[PDB]
Symmetry: C3
Subunit: 279 residues, 3 copies
C-alpha cells in the first residue's frame, strides 16, 4: 500500500469533505498529520521558549515549588531530560507569564484534540455510551519534554487520540517513526501541522474501525537534541463499553459480564502507552 502518512485539514473534515479517505486512513493506518486546527508554530514556540528558559535558568528552588511530591509527571516539573506536564486543573506554574501562555496553549491543544476526536467518531458512525460530548469532556494530559543530545521500543497509545508537536533536530535527524504498511515511516516536524496518533480507545469506542499504530524513537550525534509536546486525550474512568465487542476487535479482556468501564479495564491509575507482548 501507500505507506505515506496522510494529511487532513480539520476544517475540511468538519465541512464533510474527504470522508472516505478519512475512514480508510483511520482503519488502515490510524495516524495522520492535521492542519487547520488552531495550532500554530508561532504559538508552539512561545510556550516552548518560556518552558526552556525555565528548564535552563530555573533554580532548584523554583523547580521544587512546581514539582509534585510523587514523580508521576502528571503536573508541573520533572527532572530525569526534563518534562513539564499539565491538565485542565491542579496545575503548577512557575510564574504569571508562564501560566497565561501555557493555559492558552493547553486550551488550544484540548480544543483541537476534542475536535479531531469528534470527527473520528462522526466518520465511523459512533455514539459512545452516554453521548459524544460527555465522552470528550474527559481527562487529558499534556507533557512537554526536552531531550538533550532506536532510543525507545515500539508502543501503541491507550488514548482516544494523541496529538504531537515537535521541534526538529538542528542536524535534521528525524527521531519519531511509526509502523505504516509494515514499514518504518518517518514522522518529521511540520511547522504547519500536528501529528495525530489514534489510540486503543479509538479502536474500542468505534468497534474496531480505527487502528492504534505502533511507534518508536530512532537513535541517530551533534545537533540531535529535540523537544516534543504530547497531548493525550484520555477517557473518563466511567467510560462504558461492550465486553463482547471489545473481544471482537482484539482486546484481550478478562472482564466478567456484558459491559465494563475504562477503570475496570485499565485499573485505578491511567496507563498511557503499551508494548506488544513477548509471551
Amino acid at each position: 500500500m501507500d505507506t505515506t502518512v496522510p494529511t487532513f485539514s480539520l476544517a475540511e473534515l468538519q465541512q464533510g469533505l474527504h470522508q472516505d479517505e478519512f475512514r480508510r486512513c483511520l482503519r488502515d493506518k490510524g495516524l495522520f498529520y492535521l492542519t487547520d486546527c488552531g495550532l500554530t508554530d508561532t504559538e508552539l514556540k512561545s510556550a516552548k521558549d518560556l518552558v526552556i528558559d525555565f528548564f535552563e535558568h530555573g533554580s532548584e528552588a523554583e523547580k521544587r515549588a512546581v514539582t509534585s511530591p510523587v514523580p508521576t509527571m502528571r503536573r508541573g516539573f520533572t527532572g530525569l531530560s526534563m518534562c513539564y506536564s499539565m491538565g485542565t486543573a491542579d496545575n503548577l506554574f512557575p510564574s504569571g507569564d508562564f501560566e497565561r501562555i501555557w493555559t492558552q496553549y493547553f486550551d488550544r491543544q484540548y480544543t483541537a484534540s476534542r475536535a479531531v476526536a469528534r470527527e473520528v467518531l462522526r466518520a465511523t458512525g459512533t455514539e459512545p455510551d452516554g453521548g459524544v460530548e460527555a465522552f470528550l469532556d474527559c481527562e487529558p494530559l499534556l507533557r512537554f519534554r526536552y531531550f538533550p543530545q532506536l532510543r525507545m521500543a515500539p508502543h501503541y497509545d491507550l488514548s482516544m487520540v494523541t496529538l504531537i508537536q515537535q521541534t526538529p533536530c538542528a542536524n535534521g535527524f528525524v527521531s519519531l517513526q511509526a509502523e505504516v504498511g509494515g514499514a518504518f515511516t518517518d514522522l518529521p516536524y511540520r511547522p504547519d501541522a500536528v501529528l495525530v496518533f489514534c489510540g486503543a480507545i479509538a479502536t474500542l469506542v468505534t468497534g474496531g474501525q480505527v487502528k492504534a499504530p505502533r511507534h518508536h524513537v530512532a537513535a541517530p550525534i551533534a545537533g540531535s537534541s529535540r523537544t516534543s509536546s504530547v497531548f493525550f486525550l484520555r477517557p473518563n474512568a466511567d467510560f462504558t463499553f461492550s465486553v463482547p465487542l471489545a473481544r471482537e476487535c482484539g482486546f484481550d479482556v478478562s472482564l466478567d459480564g456484558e459491559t465494563a468501564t475504562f477503570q475496570d479495564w485499565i485499573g485505578g491509575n491511567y496507563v498511557n502507552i503499551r508494548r506488544t507482548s513477548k509471551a
Copy 2:
C-alpha cells in the same frame, strides 16, 4: 535432586498410573513432557507449513486483512519475528485451507490442555469453586511464532497450564530452558511429546500443590532460527478462590475479604507471564 524433566503419558495418567510420581513432579518441578495426548509431529508440521507459507509469501494486503486494529496478539497476524494467534472464536483466517487446518490444530491443543489440567486437578484432589468442567471451559489463547536467526529473561506463567510445541534449530541449538532443582535444564524439541508448564493458576486452584517454574530463552548463529506453538489454558474472569489460601502459598495479594475472582486479582486484561520482583 534429579534435575531431569520427566515425561508422562496422558493415557497412562488417565488410567490411574504413576499417581505418586505425577504428584511429586507437580510439587517439585511443575513441568514435564506429555506423550499420548493427540498431538502429532505430522500435524504440527501441516499447521506450521501453511502458516510459514503465509508469513513468507502472504502479501501486506492479505496480512492486513487478518490483523487486528490493536496489536495485542490475541487473534490473527502480528509482524514485529512474526506471530499468528487464535482462540475458540473471533478468529482471523487467511483462507479456507488455513482455517480447516488451524481449527483442527487448535482443537487438538485445547483438548490436550483440558485433559492434562483435569489430571493435575484429580491428582491433587482439587475441586475448583463451581466444579471442574466449568473451570476448564475457559479462555485459551494460542500463539505460533517464527523467530529468525539469554534472549528472554526468566518468567513464570500465569496460566493453569501452558503447552509448548517447537521446531528445532537446524544447527541443533536448544533455546528453551527452565529452572529445575536450582539448575538451568534444557527443554529440547521432542517430535513425540509436548512440553507442559504449570502456571500460577495451577498453584492457586490446588492450594499450593503445584509449582509454577521459571523459564527463559538462551541465545546461541547460522541455523538458529526456530518456531514455537504456545497454548495458554487461562481461567474465566469469574474463577473464584479463597484469599487466605492464596496468601498461604505465596501470592502477594491485596484483596479485601475472603474470596476473590481472577479478574479481581489480575485486572481487566489477561496477563500471561510474570517476572520475579527486583524490589
Copy 3:
C-alpha cells in the same frame, strides 16, 4: 538546597523535638537516617550470619522446603543473587534457630517502621480514614538479599515507609543513591542507623505533605558484594482515601467517584516500586 540526607532520633521525635526540621525533611526530601529506633548492628549481623550460612551451606533440599510454589519473593527462599522474605505470618523457616532469630528481627523492624510512620502522621496532622492504629496494623513485607560481585534504574516506593539496613562493600563502594535536591546523593551504610524512604502512600495519606523520592543502585569490582534488608510498611487493601485529594498531589488516578481503596488504586496484587513514565 542542602542535599544532605538528614538523621533523626526516633526517641527525640517521640518527645516532640525537631518538629519543623522533620516536617521540612518530609516535604522536601522524603528520606532520612533514623537512630534510636531499636535496630542494632549487632542484631542485624546475627540475622545476617544465619541467613548467609543458609544461602551458602543450605542444600537444595533444605532450600526447596522453604521455597514457595510460585516465585513471588513473598515468603521463604528465592534463588536468582539470593533472597529471604518474611511477614507477620505464613512464614517458611529453615530451622528453630533461624526462626527465633528472624522472628525477633522482623518484629523489631515492624515496630520501628510503625513508630516512624506514626511520627510522619503526627508531624503532618494526619488522621487516616479509620484511624492511625488500624492504618498501621497492616501488610508489611521484609526482603533480605545477598548480591554477589547503575545496576538498577530509578524507582520510587509505593509503601507508607520503607526501612533499609545494609552491609557495606568490603572495598567501600557505596551502591545505593537517591535523588536529593536534583543531585545523586550516596546512601552509605551506618552501623548506628536505618535508612528510611517515604513512599507514595505517605504522600497520599498526608495529602501531599511527604515526598516519595526516587532512588537507584550504582554499579562500580573486587569486593563489591553486599547485602540489604528492605522492610516495606504497606497498607491494608481496604485503606481508603479521597480521590480528589489524590489528584491534587500528583496521583494520576482513573477512579470514578469520591473515595477509593488501596486495592482500587493498585489492583489485586501488591506493587512495591514504580518507575517514572517514558510516555
